Design a protein around this ligand. Structure first.
Ligand SMILES: CC(C)n1nc(-c2cc3cc(O)ccc3[nH]2)c2c(N)ncnc21
Lengths: 317, 1058
């Protein structure tokens, strides 16, 4: 199940974490995650085990032992845990919580405690790690984005438009671009002054995309740095050219008549390694696989009883 | 026939709206403002226009919008913009002109008419005539009037009207006589031509008919020299009385101008100018005063003002302050006063006493402004304090009476005390210090006290604030003889009446440890005892049964003093209250709560020392022996078990066993199971079992609770109804009903275990807010009021609440509708759980979806729909809605300042006869509900989806928001009275307990709450730094009260989807 070269994971309000075989739609294994909805899923760089950020815990089921239950649970934090992220070298894990803290966990040791804590006023929705492993980008509900230098412990903060909750941020693998998406449904793009190694690492504003009228729920860059994907409460995943920042492909699930009252938000996405395909999480209980170029619905992974809020997607050798 | 015409309309609006429900078209939008207008519902329709703007910028040209929004001043500058950018465009000019004729800008209206006379447009030629006739009428130029009248057709009411004026100037009264009777008939027939769907031309016909009847008196003023006082009286009275917006009075005066020049009217035009300043048309107000001065728009700006007419100058000076130039304004005042006192002291040759007096009274007003303005320009500090105090005392001198003068002086003195106290807390934050502090505070306290006393006497009927203030000083000043002397002088001086307003506050300090303070209180209360007892017994009775010795001691003393006096009243009231507290929680009910508590401490907490404290008062309670049949029936079936269950507990006390203790709980759980069974059986109480004494009571001298007030003959407890329905609830409250000595019956809620003393002061606040709303003319225009209750506390546990008729809880009305229409009551709830079983723990983002999901698959109607089906007609449906929208808004704002939380669907209700809404349960006050740990309210007041729905379509734009600012404006104006009351029970010694619940000294906590409140009353409630004006703050509140993010967070019971 971590032995298949393609790990595809789905989580939601239905107390399971389901694993799928990408190319078929067959659900492989399914895992018990009770007493909470899953907020975020992320497969560890090591491909050994997957993390499930939820209500006041991060349970972590194993991809190699192909069977058991959580190897590691992390506790002692109140209010939700919104984002997870790992540092390339095996042992570090980051989290944004409703408790207004970004936290760094030593995976290679004991303690329900965490190695570090970074307080903010206002809950943290998303946390991601600059590819250089040196800085952690933190977005909160006030509309502030914090760059946390993991060396200098210097915090530096940036608000775009906000008096508006920034919902997710992400940063292209090539470290050229950073993107923040907020509850207005805007998408901000910054250029990266690659300071690094004896660092500066500045951000130069490039564009605001009027991506959506409704909440924008997540944003993500293709591994290529070619494309920017934006998921939203308008039941849509919009894929943007990084050359143009114009709309390339729109994936959506909006009925076919004004009187259907929605059914489903586009909660998340993950690109494929070759950036050819995109996975989609939705409140209509499905994950979906799309052709990024045609916007074809190349598959529909059905199983969850209740809504789907997370994906994880892995293509490593 | 006339009452039957609006019925046709109301019932058409109902559908016209229900149509707009299905799809907002500019078509409907047009026929909605129209029909709402015939229905002479102007402000509701004005809401419709707001929606017109914020969706279709599509009768276009922002100047045409500013014109329909009667905002001529905005439309004029927007029409200039649109004329200079574009070309001539004959219609742009017409609008540009209408803006002038409403603004009374005759100078520009006449010029704009002549200067542009190509006007190849012939309709443009026709409309042109009417305006440029009145324009020339305001500019004297009668030739110009005649020319432009010779172009107005004699068929129009307007054509016939302006002929009447031209004749009356050129003295042709037989012509003028006939022109009026024709203009009447040309307007009579015109009011049936546009038989409803007209402008404020049905309201402005009353402007023309007024002018026509006045213009017939102008005829009377030419021929008969002996109505020159009769006519001027009716002219003058039908003015202070009359209320017609600025614009109409211009015209009305212009009629009177044909006969009396402004310099003979003066008071008339100063009164008019006065109004132009309050409504905020200063540029106009000015031009009136410049004429009355007959001296420059003080273009010679560095020069002194002319003292020729002291009254007119004073107007100008404040018009100056209200205008931009206000350091300048302040200057001219200092000097103007100096010129005035010299114009008195010398120029008063004896045989001129009236001039002297009016001159001293004008000065007192000047001195008040001087103090007022000085404060505004400088603030409060060591340099202003003496000056304004001097300014005010000076004002006191020249008027002696005058509430305002004596008030201002006291408040200044009282803020001097505050300024220094609050400075010294600053000093102590970082012996000769205290000795100068005490000399300081003593120096300003005594006059403060003194001031408030003379101010109170001059109010009488309207002084709650001042009265409360006297108390702050009285209680706060742990009594230094100086202050005590001044108080005891005052107490003697001022009427007893006064203190009734304040009885709860006084009794809150019955047991003041400070000796010099207590004495006076007791004395005062006993004198309040002498005249109007009744106003005293109930409140004293509560106190006389108080765990705290001091309280019930000193309470009894006053009652004793009242027996040498009204003994059998003290005696009756004594027993009626006792018995009602027995009836409130029956013996077994107390055992039922006391057994639950004791099992939580023992079996759930290992607390036997807490447990013993729970049961022993219930054991000692019965130790007295049964006294009513119900107490004996209980005693038989449970007494023996319980008395021996305590036996085993008291064997354990000494043996320290656990097998001794386990025999007791064996017996204890036995009776619990017995009682629990019989509890849902309690659905009625009969007096003859429960309290016999109360059944016996016939024709008492005691007054029916909360009915006593002077003015009104005393209504007494003539008999108590034999049965009490027990409303089945968590606190099974009884529905007690009394028979009145006037005939009519009086119903009450007899509550068991809720400290009703808070809700009491809350009523007090509402009382005041009602007075304020009655006194603001706009609020009075719209009948705006709060529903208050009669809250008669009985103990810390119990009390009586006045029963309001014709009401069902919001929850009820819905529960019924849903069951009638076959909808599952809690459907939004079930839907939400079906979607997300873990709803309570979702991220905000996640919740908002689940919430929206529920909302989108359920009817938003119900309340709107059930209120239509209820209605017996359609006009009755319509006015019940007008009443609803307004009453709901009033409490929205009031509730906000009060910080009134917990507004779930069972805590508010709707009077099914008037349509008005009413709130119950005022426990969760101040931010409390939002500060709590579990499930914190984010809502400022329930402005929920079915409440919105039930209003007019275009609701929040219409009557709701309008009524919002109005209420809020009244509140901010009277921010001090409102705060007097609030401080009164934040710092109330017996009520601070509701702020140590932030856990589940207080000095600092109480400070916050009040600051929080002031912030709300000054528009600082949001951004610390901004000072938001009303409509902004209002808009902000609605926004917040409406946000899905806020609502999806509400505790589910609150029903954020209702
Ligand atoms: C039983 C339901 C319908 N109900 N609750 C009340 C009620 C009003 C009320 C007012 C308070 O200040 C404190 C508690 C209260 N409880 C009421 C009332 N005052 N009059 C008529 N019905 C009423």
């Amino acid at each position: 199940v971590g032995s298949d070269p393609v790990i595809l994971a789905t989580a939601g309000y239905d107390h399971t974490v389901r694993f799928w075989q990408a190319h078929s739609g067959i659900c492989t294994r399914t895992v018990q995650h009770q007493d909470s909805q899953v907020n975020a899923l992320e497969v560890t760089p090591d491909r050994s085990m997957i993390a499930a950020a939820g209500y006041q815990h991060i349970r972590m089921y194993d991809l190699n032992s192909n069977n058991p239950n959580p190897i590691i649970s992390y506790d002692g934090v109140n209010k939700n845990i919104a984002s997870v992220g790992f540092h390339e070298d095996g042992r570090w894990m980051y989290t944004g919580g409703e408790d207004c803290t970004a936290r760094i966990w030593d995976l290679r040791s004991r303690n329900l405690q965490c190695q570090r804590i970074f307080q903010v006023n206002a809950p943290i929705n998303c946390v991601c790690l600059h590819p250089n492993q040196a800085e952690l980008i933190v977005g909160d509900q006030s509309g502030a984005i914090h760059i946390w230098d993991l060396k200098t412990d210097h915090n530096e903060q940036l608000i775009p438009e906000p008096e508006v909750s920034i919902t997710s941020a992400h940063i292209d693998p090539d470290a050229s671009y950073m993107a923040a998406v907020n509850s207005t449904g805007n998408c901000y793009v910054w250029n990266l002054t690659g300071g690094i190694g004896d660092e500066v690492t500045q951000l130069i504003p490039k564009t605001k995309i009027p991506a959506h009228t409704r909440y924008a729920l997540q944003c993500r860059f293709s591994p290529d740095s070619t494309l920017l994907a934006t998921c939203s409460a308008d039941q849509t995943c919009k894929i943007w050219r990084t050359s143009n920042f114009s709309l390339m492909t729109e994936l959506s699930i909006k009925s076919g008549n004004p009187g259907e009252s929605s059914r489903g938000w586009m909660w998340g996405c993950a690109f494929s390694g070759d950036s050819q395909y995109i996975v989609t999480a939705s409140s209509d209980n499905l994950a979906r696989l799309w052709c990024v170029e045609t916007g074809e619905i190349k598959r529909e992974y059905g199983g969850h009883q209740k809504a789907v809020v997370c994906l994880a997607f892995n293509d490593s050798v | 026939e006339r009452a039957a015409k609006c019925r046709a309309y109301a019932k058409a609006l109902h559908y016209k709206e229900l149509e707009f429900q299905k799809g907002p078209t500019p078509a409907i939008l047009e026929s909605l403002i129209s029909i709402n207008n015939k229905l002479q519902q102007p402000e509701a329709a004005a809401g419709v226009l707001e929606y017109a703007m914020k969706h279709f910028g599509e009768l276009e040209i922002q100047a045409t919008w500013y014109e329909k929004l009667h905002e001529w001043e905005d439309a004029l500058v927007a029409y200039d913009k649109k004329m200079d950018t574009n070309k001539d465009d004959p219609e742009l000019m017409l609008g540009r002109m209408r803006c002038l004729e409403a603004l009374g800008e005759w100078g520009q209206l006449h010029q704009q008419c002549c200067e542009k006379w190509t006007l190849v447009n012939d309709e443009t030629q026709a409309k042109m005539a009417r305006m440029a006739a009145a324009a020339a009428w305001g500019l004297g130029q009668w030739d110009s009037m005649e020319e432009y009248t010779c172009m107005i057709p004699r068929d129009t009411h307007d054509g016939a009207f302006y002929r009447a004026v031209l004749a009356l100037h050129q003295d042709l009264f037989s012509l003028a006589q006939q022109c009026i009777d024709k203009a009447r008939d040309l307007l009579d027939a015109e009011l049936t031509a546009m038989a409803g769907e007209s402008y404020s031309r049905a309201y402005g016909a009353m402007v023309s008919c007024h002018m026509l009847s006045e213009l017939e008196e102008v005829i009377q003023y030419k021929l008969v020299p002996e109505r020159r006082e009769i006519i001027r009286q009716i002219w003058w009275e039908r003015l202070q009385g009359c209320q017609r917006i600025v614009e109409d009075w211009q015209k009305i005066l212009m009629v009177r101008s044909l006969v009396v020049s402004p310099h003979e009217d003066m008071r008339t035009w100063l009164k008019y100018a006065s109004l132009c300043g309050k409504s905020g048309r200063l540029a106009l107000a000015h031009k009136t005063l410049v004429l009355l001065l007959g001296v420059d728009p003080s273009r010679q700006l560095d020069h002194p003002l002319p003292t020729v007419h002291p009254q007119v100058t004073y107007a100008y000076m404040k018009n100056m302050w209200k205008s931009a130039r206000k350091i300048d304004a302040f200057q001219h005042m200092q000097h103007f006063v100096q010129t005035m006192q010299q114009q008195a002291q010398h120029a008063i040759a004896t045989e001129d006493q009236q001039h002297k007096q009016e001159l001293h009274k004008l000065m007192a007003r000047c001195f008040l402004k001087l103090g007022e303005w000085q404060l505004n320009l400088q603030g409060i500090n060591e340099s202003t304090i003496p000056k304004v105090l001097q300014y005010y005392s000076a004002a006191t001198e020249h008027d002696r009476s005058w509430y305002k003068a004596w008030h201002a002086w006291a408040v200044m003195n009282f803020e001097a005390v505050l300024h220094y106290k609050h400075q010294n807390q600053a000093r102590d934050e970082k012996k000769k210090v205290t000795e100068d502090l005490s000399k300081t505070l003593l120096m300003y306290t005594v006059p403060a006290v003194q001031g408030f006393f003379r101010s109170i006497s001059l109010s009488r009927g309207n002084n709650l604030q001042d009265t409360l203030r006297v108390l702050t000083l009285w209680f706060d000043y742990g009594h230094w003889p100086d202050v005590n002397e001044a108080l005891v002088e005052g107490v003697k001086a001022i009427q007893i009446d006064t203190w009734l307003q304040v009885i709860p506050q006084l009794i809150a300090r019955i047991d003041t440890p400070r000796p010099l303070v207590g004495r006076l209180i007791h004395q005062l209360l006993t004198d309040i005892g002498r005249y109007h007892p009744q106003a005293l017994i109930y409140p004293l009775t509560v106190a006389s049964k108080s765990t705290t010795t001091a309280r019930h001691n000193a309470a009894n003393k006053i009652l004793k003093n009242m027996c040498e006096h009204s003994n059998t009243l003290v005696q009756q009231a004594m027993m009626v209250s006792e018995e009602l507290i027995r009836v409130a929680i029956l013996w077994h009910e107390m055992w039922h709560e006391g057994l639950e508590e004791a099992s939580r401490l023992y079996f759930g907490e290992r607390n036997v020392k807490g447990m013993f404290e729970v049961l022993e008062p219930l054991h000692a309670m019965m130790e007295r022996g049964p006294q009513t049949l119900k107490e004996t029936s209980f005693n038989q079936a449970y007494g023996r078990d319980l008395m021996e269950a305590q036996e085993w507990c008291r064997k354990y006390m000494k043996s320290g066993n656990v097998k001794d203790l386990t025999q007791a709980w064996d017996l204890y759980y036995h009776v619990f199971r017995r009682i629990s069974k019989q509890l849902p059986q309690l659905t009625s109480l009969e007096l003859q079992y429960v309290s016999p004494k109360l059944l016996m009571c016939r024709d008492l001298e005691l007054a029916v609770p909360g009915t006593y007030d002077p003015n009104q003959p005393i209504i007494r407890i003539q008999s108590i109804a034999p049965s009490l329905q027990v409303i089945t609830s968590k606190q099974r409250p009884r529905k007690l009903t009394l028979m009145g000595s006037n005939g009519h019956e009086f119903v009450f809620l007899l509550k068991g275990h809720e400290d009703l003393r808070q809700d009491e002061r809350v009523m007090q606040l509402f009382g005041l807010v009602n007075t304020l709303l009655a006194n603001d003319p706009t609020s009075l225009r719209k009948n705006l009021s709060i529903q208050r209750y009669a809250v008669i506390p009985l103990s810390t546990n119990s009390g009586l609440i006045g029963w309001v008729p014709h009401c069902d809880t919001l929850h009820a009305l819905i529960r019924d509708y849903r069951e009638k229409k076959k909808i599952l009551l809690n459907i939004e709830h079930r839907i939400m759980l079906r979607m997300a079983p873990d709803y309570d723990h979702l991220t905000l983002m996640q919740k908002v979806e689940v919430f929206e999901h529920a909302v989108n698959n359920t009817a938003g109607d119900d309340l709107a729909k059930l209120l239509w089906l209820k209605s017996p007609s359609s006009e009755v449906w319509f006015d019940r809605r007008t009443n609803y929208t307004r009453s709901l808004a009033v409490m929205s704002m009031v509730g906000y300042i009060l910080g009134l939380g917990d507004r779930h669907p069972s805590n508010l209700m709707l009077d099914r006869l008037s349509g008005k809404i009413l709130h119950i349960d005022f426990g969760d006050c101040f931010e409390v509900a939002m500060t709590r740990e579990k499930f914190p309210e984010k809502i400022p007041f329930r402005l929920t989806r079915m409440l919105t729905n039930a209003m007019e379509v275009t609701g929040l734009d219409g009557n709701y928001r309008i009524t919002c600012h109005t209420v809020m404006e009244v509140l901010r104006e009277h921010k001090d009275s409102v705060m007097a009351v609030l401080e009164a029970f934040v710092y109330d010694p017996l009520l601070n307990w509701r702020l140590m619940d932030t856990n589940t000294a207080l000095n600092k906590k109480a400070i916050q709450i009040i600051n929080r409140v002031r912030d709300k009353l000054t528009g600082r409630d949001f951004s610390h730094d901004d000072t938001l004006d009303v409509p902004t703050q209002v808009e902000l509140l609605i926004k917040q009260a409406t946000s899905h993010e806020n609502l999806c967070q509400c505790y589910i019971g609150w029903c954020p989807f209702w």
